[PDB]
């Protein structure tokens, strides 16, 4: 017998809570990161180790530009709820 | 032994559903930027050897039926299922163009009890949406 | 650059 | 600058909205499992590695035993969040 | 590049909080079996390199000031910090001897704006408890 | 074994 709820992932652009931050000529920043590490590592990389680097690149490389000063120089992390019970590789 | 079985004749469906475009009782706005997304996405996903499919600008009723469907296809011979919402969203709730729904009840249908082909196999969702209404404002 | 309601 | 949420890591022995199980003469399933875990992997495994196979663990050596017939033969599986933006060895 | 720098003096500090006997008002039960766990885990994040202490049937107010009294720690020559909670909870909180208090206000005395010697470091919490009253009858 | 309120 098995869990109902097991061998489920959730990778979530923002934590509980807060808004995502969308860049309408890019695209939204958790998308580019993403899409960005797959093509390097998506099929070299374990999938938590690649949201751990999505997550580090959100972090780091994405700052909010807005005229509105308080949605100005925000930031976002991005968050991984896993429920799977082996590692997960694209191969 | 420690790693999930992807010896299978395919990888999975992949699923995105991009919402764009919403009813303006609604409140939100159009969200500029999103096919840029759906387009690195499905070309990132199909790259990696995922049947992918895109809808776009699906009500609440679509998006249930969708993944219902979905679920009750025969995912055996698949090695696991992917499916990525780009659209609204606020705290466990996400925005279909005509209001919003609760993103655990669009993941249950893929529950081990009902999606019995999809059993110990990774089901993975992707969600590009806000999550409430707070800001992080950093720190150096 | 904007976010994915305003409460 | 860097996100203020970066960096967190909630282990959960069990997902939002459901019970946690315990057996009063071995402990805890999820502490079971965990250090078990531990024990054996502490210093070799990433964390995402020991806390992923925790989960396989407590979602397949443990069903319930109780009086009850509606708390019997219940099943568990733990849940991770993860706001990591690097890999995590105790090394 | 991709590991978290361990090069501390200190691996971190280790609260462990065990909840056993839960006073009247609360109406929960006693949780036999939860000392051993908090020895197992003792030994387990001791054996890892953590200064680990024990707090025994901790008040929520005691819980609140333990982990603000932690996050004002200097943590400069520490790589981590980790907390495990060992109680009865529901839904986003947990109890402590005397009733609830939210897990989401334990855990942002921690916030990279509110404790800066743990910026870019991992903050690990552990909670063994409820998180509601579902049962997952499983599927063979 | 037991659980972690009934509600």
Known sequence: ???????FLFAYSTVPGYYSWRSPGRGSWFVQALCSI??????????????????????????????????????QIPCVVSMLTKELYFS | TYQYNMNFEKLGKCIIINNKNFDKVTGMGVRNGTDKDAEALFKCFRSLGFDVIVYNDCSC??????????????????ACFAC??????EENVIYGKDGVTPIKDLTAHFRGDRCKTLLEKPKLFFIQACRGTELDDGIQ | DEVXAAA
Not at chain 1, 49 to 68: G, K, M, P, W, Y
């Open chain 2, 84 to 89: 990525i919402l780009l659209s609204h969203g």
């Open chain 1, 1 to 7: 017998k098995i869990p109902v709820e097991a061998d």
């Open chain 2, 61 to 78: 009723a679509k998006m249930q039926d969708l993944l219902k469907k979905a679920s009750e296809e025969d995912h055996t011979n698949a």
């Open chain 1, 38 to 75: 797959l093509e390097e590592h998506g099929k070299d990389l374990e999938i938590m180790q690649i949201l751990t680097r999505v997550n580090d690149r959100v972090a780091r490389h994405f700052e909010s530009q807005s005229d509105d000063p308080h949605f100005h120089e925000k930031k």
